Design a protein around this ligand. Structure first.
Ligand code: BCL
Ligand code: BCL
Ligand code: BCL
Ligand code: BCL
Ligand code: BCL
Ligand code: BCL
Ligand code: BCL
Ligand code: BCL
Ligand code: BCL
Lengths: 53, 49, 49, 53, 49, 53, 49, 53, 49, 53, 49, 53, 49, 53, 49, 53, 49, 53, 49, 53, 49, 53, 53, 49, 53, 53, 49, 49
């Protein structure tokens, strides 16, 4: 999908596609944030010093 | 077609969708620049030292 | 359209929705500024020291 | 969605969208509050000294 | 509309609902003032010392 | 929802909305009270001294 | 309306319900006063000492 | 609901509302009594001295 | 009404029910007085000493 | 309910109400007796000395 | 009524039921007196000493 | 329910009431016997000396 | 009545049932006497000593 | 039920009543025998000396 | 009756059943006498000593 | 049931009664044999001395 | 009767069944005598010594 | 059943009775063999000396 | 009969079945003789010594 | 069943009887072989000396 | 018969089946002879020594 | 089944019988191979010396 | 599939194929990233020194 | 054909799909070159030393 | 299947066959990669020296 | 089957037979490879010296 | 027959199937020879020494 | 036939399928040569030394 592919919505239902995309994006963002929290350097709440080695 | 929309309707929906997607990607790019400025996330050969 | 509303009804719903969303985001922004003044949440290179 | 996209409600049902948005926002707020509670510096009830390191 | 109520019934219900919500929020605000006067719940830099 | 949005009840059924709101408010109140009970400073029944640090 | 009762029947049921709720709340208030006189349940800064 | 809102019974069925309210009140009373029993000061059966600290 | 009973039948059932409830509560009150005379169940400041 | 509210049985079925009330009362009595048995002072079968402190 | 019985049948069934319940309670009372004379079950202040 | 309330059988079915009453009475008797067996003084089979303290 | 039997059939069935129950109870009574003569099952104040 | 209450079989079905009573009596007999076996003095198979203290 | 058998059929079946039951009980009685002569199963006051 | 009560088979189906009686008798015999096997004196296969005390 | 067989068929089936059961029991009896000669399975007062 | 009771097959179906009897006899034989295997003296495969005491 | 076979078909099937069962039992008997000649499986009084 | 009871197949279906008998004989053979493998003397694969005592 | 085949079709299928089964058994017999020549699987009185 | 019993296929369906026989033979072969693998002498992969005792 | 095999969409439905391909690609990308995170050298978040041996 | 598309629609969809797949593969190739430049992922004989 | 057996698609449906083949090939590739990762010499991410013995 | 038994496909459906045979062969190959990997001598990935004794 | 195929169709399918099976077995035989030349898999009396 | 395709469609699909399968096999062969040149995966008698 690009800017010029407007005809993709004659194949994909815009409402269901939007809902599925929102769910996927939220889940991915949560996963990435949790991965950052799962490591010492990038857990901004834990606040370890940047040099973890 | 298989969704019931017309090509004219598909054009305006895709315009709004493309603008929203570009805005989301721009915000994410700015956030990644900020995160890098906070703590860069590609380590060198010696790790995080 | 697919929801049964008209454009006039959609516009007047969207006005209230936009006002409510803007108010919620404004309260959240004020809350985040307050939380930052309480305890900033982006640690420097030495962490929370 | 922006201030000028009122036609999104011709595609999304306002009542069900409002309910789903409220559920998502409440769950997100609970998750973020619990994440703050799960870390020493930002657990306001525990009241640790801010400098945890 | 989609609930069966009329605008007159909706307005009359909304008056009572708004009064009840305002009363609940007022009681909650008084309760939070009382709880803060018991034990404040935003810690300073040194914590609960 | 504000003091002037009385037409929200032409979209949401007052009885079911009231029941859902009561359930949500009760669950939230119980959760917050339990969080207070789960911390030394704010467990009023346990009665720890206020300065827990 | 949606329950089958009449405003006249709703009024008398609400009269009985209001009397019962007021009695329940009065008994609860007396019970809380008694419980406080037994053991107060809001600790001071030093706790239960 | 106040002393003047008798019309609330044209929306809520009195019998089912009374049953649900009785269930909720019994459950809440049991929960609060159990919370009191779960703390040293307010377990009247166990009878700890009031000054638990 | 909604139970099929008549007010005359409801009145006599309520008479019997009220007598039975009053008797149950009276027996419970005597039992609680007896239990208190066995072992009082509201402790003083020093507990069960 | 009071001594004068006889028309409560035009709303609640007497037989099912009696069965539910009997079940509730029996369950509450069992719970309270078990709570007495769960504490040293009030377990009359165990027969601890009354002054448990 | 709602059971299919008549007052005459209900009266004689209640006669038998009442006699049987009274006999059961009398046997239980005698049994409790016997159990008490075996081992009393309300302890004094010092317990089972 | 007393000696004079024979009309209670115009509301409660005698056969099902008898079956339920027998089941409840047998369960209550078993529970009380098991509670006696569960304590030193009143377990007649174990036959502890009566003064358990 | 509710059962398919008549009073005449019920009376003779009850005769047989009463005889069988009385025989069962007599055997149980003899068995309990025998069990007591083997090992009495109500302990005295000192227990099984 | 007594010797004179033969009309109880116009209310209770003799065959199902007999089967249920046999099941209850067998279960009760098994329970009491097992309770005897569960105590030293009255487990005739184990044959502890009668005086068990 | 409720089983389809006649009284004569019930009589002959009960004759066979009674004979079989008596034989089973007799074999069990002989087995119990044999088991007793092997190891008696009612202990005295001192147990199995 | 006695020798004279041949009319019990006009109430109980002889085939199903025989099957149920056989099942009950087999289960009872198995249970009693297992109880004997579960005690030292009467486990004839284990062959302990008769005086187990 | 309730199985569809006649008395003539029941008689010959019972003849074969009786012969088979008697043969099975005879083999089991011989097997038990052999097992007893191998190792008797009823212990004396001292057990398996 | 005896040699003269051929009319039992007018009541019990010969085929299903034979199948059930075979199943019961196989299960009983397996149980008894396993019981012999489970005891030292009569486990012929283990081959303990006969005098186990 | 109840299987659909005739006596002749049942007779020839039984002939084949009987031959097969006899052969299987003969093989099993030879196998048991071989297994006994490998290791006899009935222990004497002293066991496998 | 003997060499002369060919009429057994007028009540027992040859195919189902054959399948059931094959399954039973296979399961019995496996069980007996496993019992032999479960004992030192007769586990021919393990090859213990015949005198295990 | 109960299957859709005829005696001729059953005969030719059985010819193929018999040839296949004989081949399978011959291969298994050769395999067992080979396995025995590798490691015999019937232990003597002293086991695998 | 022998070389002369071709009529057995008028009773057993050749396709289903062949599928069941193949399944049984494969399972039996796997079982025997696994039993060989489960013993030291005959686990050819493990390659223990043949004299395991 | 190549650039010239456009007739593959006369056999595979473009929309369902696209959804399945997106799901597979996302799952594969997540798996490979997680495998990198599961090894010291390629967990960029943990940031071990590259020479892990 | 079996999807409802014609050859023209299939051809244009395949043009878009081919462009998108080629872009995805090009981005993946660049990302792999970058990842190799960060930390090469095929170890030599001595491993990661 | 060879280059000359195009008639295999008159028996196997090309679309379902392609889907099943892709699934099997992906699962086999994942299994082989995981087996390589499961051994010291061939886990390229762990990067052990090749001579693991 | 042999080279001359082509009429076996008048009894077995070629497509389902091919699918079942492929599944069986793949499962058997995986099993045998895993058995080789489960032993020291034949785990080519582990690369133990051949003489494991 | 029971599959819908003709004998000619079955013959050509069997030709292809036989060729494929022979090729698979030939590849397996070459693979087994190769595996044996790598590490023989039938141990001698001393095992893998 | 049983798929709905004709021989011509089956032939062209098989042409594409054969080309794709050959390409996949060629890529796998090149990958295996590369993996061998990285680390050979058939150990000698002494293993990975
Ligand atoms: C608050 C009142 C208006 C609103 C006012 C605007 C304005 C003005 C803009 C957007 C833009 C966007 N909005 Mg908006 N937006 C509203 C409600 C929504 C809802 C929703 C379900 O309610 C969603 C999913 C969105 C989604 C989005 C993004 C997809 C889009 C891209 C920028 C961005 O914020 O990415 C990041 C995504 C998030 C942070 C997730 C949260 C989305 C929030 C609610 C969107 C509000 C955006 C911003 C805070 C408002 C001011 C935008 C600035 C001018 C940049 N809006 C309502 C209707 N929105 C921008 C755009 O179209 O890009 C070209 C844009 O300029
Ligand atoms: C309590 C009396 C009135 C009410 C009076 C007002 C007034 C006045 C305002 C709002 C505004 C808002 N209201 Mg309101 N509001 C009511 C009931 C509701 C309910 C509900 C289901 O009961 C909901 C979900 C909301 C939601 C909202 C927000 C989405 C919106 C944005 C600001 C905000 O508070 O964000 C944060 C979200 C939360 C904190 C979650 C809790 C939502 C609460 C109930 C919102 C009420 C806040 C309001 C200011 C208090 C007024 C009552 C005073 C005692 C006088 N209101 C009732 C009908 N509400 C504001 C607005 O539209 O923005 C431009 C605004 O100025
Ligand atoms: C026992 C004889 C009468 C009865 C006589 C009265 C009288 C007199 C009064 C009430 C009152 C009340 N009754 Mg009443 N009440 C009866 C049966 C019930 C039943 C029931 C399902 O059986 C329920 C749920 C109630 C409930 C209630 C309360 C909601 C209400 C408020 C005060 C209170 O006690 O709060 C606390 C709630 C509880 C402790 C649990 C509720 C259950 C019990 C049964 C409450 C009844 C206790 C009553 C006060 C005792 C007086 C009876 C004496 C024998 C004179 N009653 C029967 C029909 N009841 C009072 C009132 O209406 O307030 C203005 C009041 O003055
Ligand atoms: C035993 C023969 C009679 C009977 C004779 C009486 C008499 C006389 C009285 C009652 C009373 C009561 N009975 Mg009554 N009662 C009977 C059977 C029942 C049954 C039942 C399902 O079988 C129930 C639920 C009850 C319930 C009740 C109580 C609600 C009520 C209040 C006092 C009380 O005991 O509370 C506590 C509840 C319990 C302890 C558990 C159940 C109660 C038991 C079964 C009834 C005995 C109570 C009564 C004092 C016994 C005296 C009878 C003597 C033989 C003379 N009865 C039968 C029909 N019952 C009294 C009343 O109405 O108060 C004003 C009263 O004066
Ligand atoms: C064995 C031949 C007869 C038989 C002959 C007799 C005779 C004679 C008498 C009884 C009596 C009784 N029988 Mg009877 N009884 C038979 C079969 C049964 C069956 C059954 C389902 O098969 C049952 C449940 C019973 C039940 C009963 C008891 C309810 C009753 C009281 C004795 C008792 O409790 O002893 C405890 C034993 C049990 C609870 C187990 C019950 C089962 C056994 C089979 C009962 C037989 C009783 C006894 C052994 C008498 C047999 C002596 C004969 C001379 C052989 N019988 C058969 C039909 N039965 C007695 C009676 O009616 O009392 C007034 C009585 O005098
Ligand atoms: C073996 C050939 C005959 C047979 C011949 C006899 C003869 C003869 C007698 C019995 C008797 C009895 N049989 Mg018989 N019995 C047969 C098959 C059965 C079957 C069955 C389902 O196959 C059952 C449940 C029974 C049951 C019974 C008992 C209820 C009954 C009581 C004595 C007893 O043994 O109690 C103990 C119960 C058991 C040990 C359980 C096992 C039952 C066994 C199979 C019955 C055979 C016992 C019998 C004494 C053996 C003698 C036959 C000899 C080969 C001559 N039989 C067949 C039909 N049976 C006796 C009787 O009626 O008492 C007055 C009696 O005199
Ligand atoms: C092997 C060829 C014949 C056969 C020939 C005989 C002969 C001859 C006799 C029996 C006898 C019996 N058979 Mg036969 N039997 C066959 C197949 C069976 C089958 C079967 C489902 O396949 C079963 C369940 C039986 C069952 C039985 C017993 C119930 C019965 C009693 C003695 C006994 O062995 O008890 C113990 C039960 C077992 C050990 C399990 C039973 C299983 C085996 C197959 C029984 C055959 C035993 C028989 C003695 C072997 C002799 C056959 C020789 C080749 C000559 N047979 C086939 C049809 N069978 C005897 C009899 O009727 O008693 C008077 C008898 O004299
Ligand atoms: C943001 C505004 C446009 C958009 C603008 C463009 C432009 C311009 C291009 C693409 C290209 C691609 N887009 Mg796009 N793309 C959009 C939304 C999507 C969505 C979606 C469901 O929203 C998907 C799955 C895609 C998928 C794709 C890839 C398959 C394709 C290959 C390069 C690539 O990025 O691979 C890597 C895949 C990812 C990183 C994840 C894919 C998701 C994101 C949204 C892909 C968009 C990235 C694009 C390059 C950003 C440039 C837009 C700038 C704002 C100018 N786009 C929207 C409609 N997209 C390129 C192409 O066709 O190659 C020849 C290309 O040049
Ligand atoms: C790659 C292009 C062709 C192809 C070209 C050939 C040629 C040429 C031959 C075979 C042969 C065979 N093919 Mg082929 N084969 C193809 C796709 C398949 C598919 C499939 C579902 O895609 C399967 C299951 C098979 C199966 C088979 C075997 C049963 C058969 C026996 C030798 C063998 O490899 O056994 C081992 C089984 C495996 C290794 C499992 C893997 C299956 C792979 C795909 C088999 C193809 C390998 C083949 C030998 C490649 C030859 C090199 C070519 C010149 C490219 N082929 C495609 C259509 N195939 C040979 C034969 O018939 O023997 C007489 C033969 O000469």
């Amino acid at each position: 999908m690009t800017f010029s592919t407007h005809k993709v919505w004659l194949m994909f239902d815009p409402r269901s596609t939007l809902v599925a995309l929102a769910a996927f994006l939220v889940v991915l963002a949560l996963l990435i944030h949790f991965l950052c929290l799962g490591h010492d350097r990038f857990n901004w709440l834990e606040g370890n010093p940047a040099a973890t080695k | 077609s298989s969704t019931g929309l017309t090509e004219a309707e598909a054009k305006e929906f895709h315009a709004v969708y493309s603008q929203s997607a570009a805005g989301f990607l721009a915000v994410c790019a700015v956030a990644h620049v900020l995160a890098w400025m906070w703590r860069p996330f590609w380590p060198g050969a010696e790790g995080w030292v």
